[PDB]
C-alpha cells in the first residue's frame, strides 16, 4: 500500500 521515494520529511 506504500510509495517509496522522491519524497521527504
Amino acid at each position, epitope marked *: 500500500s*506504500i510509495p*517509496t521515494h*522522491t*519524497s*521527504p520529511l
Partner: antibody
Amino acid sequence: EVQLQQSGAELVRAGSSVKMSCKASGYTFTSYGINWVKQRPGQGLEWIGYINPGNGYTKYNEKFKGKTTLTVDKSSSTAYMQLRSLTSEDSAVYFCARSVYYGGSYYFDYWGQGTTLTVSS
Amino acid sequence: DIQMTQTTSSLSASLGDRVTISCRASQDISNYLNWYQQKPDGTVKLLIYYTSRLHSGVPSRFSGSGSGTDYSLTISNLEQEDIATYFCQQGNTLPRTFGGGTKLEIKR
C-alpha cells in the same frame, strides 16, 4: 549532486541566541524536508526537529522545543535553525539532513558538514 | 520515546574481517531502521535504510538486516576507509532516535 552547505562555526555568550544556516542545492528544495541533529562529544546524535519547506510545517522534539525554532527561505533554498536562551549544554555540532520517503517512513540521505557552536564568554 | 541501544561503543576488527554492528530498539520498530556512517573528519553518510537491507550507492559489502527489536549492520570484508562510527536510527515513532554509535578500530 545534492548538497547542503551549513553555516560557519559560531561563538556565543550564554543567555544569548544564534541562527545557523543550511543552503541546499542540486535538487528541489520544497520537495524535501530538512531535519536537524545535534552531536555533543558525549556520543550519540539527537534529533532536534523537522521542517517542510513547502508549507513551513515544523515538528519538534519535545526536549528541544521552546528553545529552538526552525524556519526556511523558499527563495534561496536555505533552512535556518535558531537556538535561544543558550547554555553550556547547547555546545555541540549541529547538522541538517534531507529526508526522503521510502515505503512508509522517512530517512536522511544527505547531511551537511555540520556547524560547530561554542557557548562561552 | 523509543530508546535505541548499541551494545558496544568501540569494536575491534582486522581489515578483511566480517564485522557486525548491533542495535536494539526499546520496542517493535516494524523494520523502520537506518544506518549512518560518520568519519573522523565529522562527515556523515547514509548506507542503509528501511529495516536495513536497502542500499543507496554504497559498496555491496555493506549489508543490513533485523526485525521487530533487533537489527544489525554487517561489513562482510572490512576496508580501511570503512574504519568509522556507525549509528542506527528508528524512523517508526516520533521523536526519531539514534543509538549511541559504534566506533571501529584496528586490532593490534
